[PDB]
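Hello,

Following up on my earlier ticket. Below are the three sequence lines again, exactly as submitted.
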Amino acid sequence: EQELLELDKWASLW
Amino acid sequence: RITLKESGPPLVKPTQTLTLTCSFSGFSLSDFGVGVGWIRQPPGKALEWLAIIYSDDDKRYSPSLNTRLTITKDTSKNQVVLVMTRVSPVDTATYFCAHRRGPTTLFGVPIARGPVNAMDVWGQGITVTISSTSTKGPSVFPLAPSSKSTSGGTAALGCLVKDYFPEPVTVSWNSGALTSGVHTFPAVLQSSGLYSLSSVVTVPSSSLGTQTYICNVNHKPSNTKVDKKVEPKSCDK
Amino acid sequence: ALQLTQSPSSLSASVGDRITITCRASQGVTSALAWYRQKPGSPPQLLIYDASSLESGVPSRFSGSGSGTEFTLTISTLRPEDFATYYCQQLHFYPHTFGGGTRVDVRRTVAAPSVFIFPPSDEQLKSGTASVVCLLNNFYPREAKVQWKVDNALQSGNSQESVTEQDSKDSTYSLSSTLTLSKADYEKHKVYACEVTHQGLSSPVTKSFNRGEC
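Thanks for your patience. The regenerated structure is below:
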């Protein structure tokens, strides 16, 4: 895993 | 049932500001988590993500364009606006707005991420050209048939439509009488800022002495029409 | 940002064929991967969302698979309306990113191009410029390489290419390469040639004229 990309709005949603 | 349509200027000058509007029907920017995003497609290239805005006014921009992009919305008008400042010819492309579903909800409760992973409905797209070039009609030059353009009992010949702006230009041969074997190439943008294309056609070399070949060029933007007769050079007579 | 590598870039197939397109992510995007089909002159159309879920209204011949970094789109039975360009997109990280695209064209037997060269017209030379055109006619596959040489000097940065859409009748492509020079430079040289490389050609082919030999 590289960079420090921002997570999408729903990336933490089941 | 979802429809989106982009509206904006088809031509903008470098360093100016470009304002694109997406008008939609079939959904509401009031729908929980719904999003509207923008994607551009430069001439003959891949899709490029630009930005997205959601029902809660949350928004994101492509990091390499964040200083020039601004996205907004008006939920009562079913519209989303994308503003791009200091544009340049690199920004010439077809711009699409698209709908992104919100998560699955059960009586208002978000229960599944699934549906949000895609842009499910796209608008027809709007082509935008950024250029400071002035309107100009083409000059037509012949691509004369010769021993160097002959293959067996077949010969190739054509027209070179050079230096015009803006697009488009239409070309036909012998007033439409000749269509078979014709190839009109997509225009290319030259470093001068003017477009250029060529149209060719293969025909029996045995007809070069009797049959007349004329390409009909029409550039509406400048009200320019030209009929160019193409024939073998004196060398081949 | 997160890089998506779509492969192959181009693919030849026939109606009824079964094709598979791959997309690799530089890092895990879980299942946040969508596939689209784009036909000439039209906007992208959604096929698969969330890596394998079939979008409502999309023919069952389309299926998707994968999770993490490797994904594949499959069309069990290729239909005529499926000859188009396909794209993957990841929505797990910002900025959302699309793959480079995968064009799918109609397969036919290899066909080397007929190469023709056209010196500039005296009409144009009078206007002060000289355009030299090289034409590659009715060939297949689409991949072709064209190089310009003026008296053995490779020309770089002063030519432009244009390619036609696959022909609906013979499934071939045509390509034009135009070399532009000023009248002055054009008249300073003799030999003008375009070297063409193509799968259908046993070896590079050269077409040229000598404006110094009359």
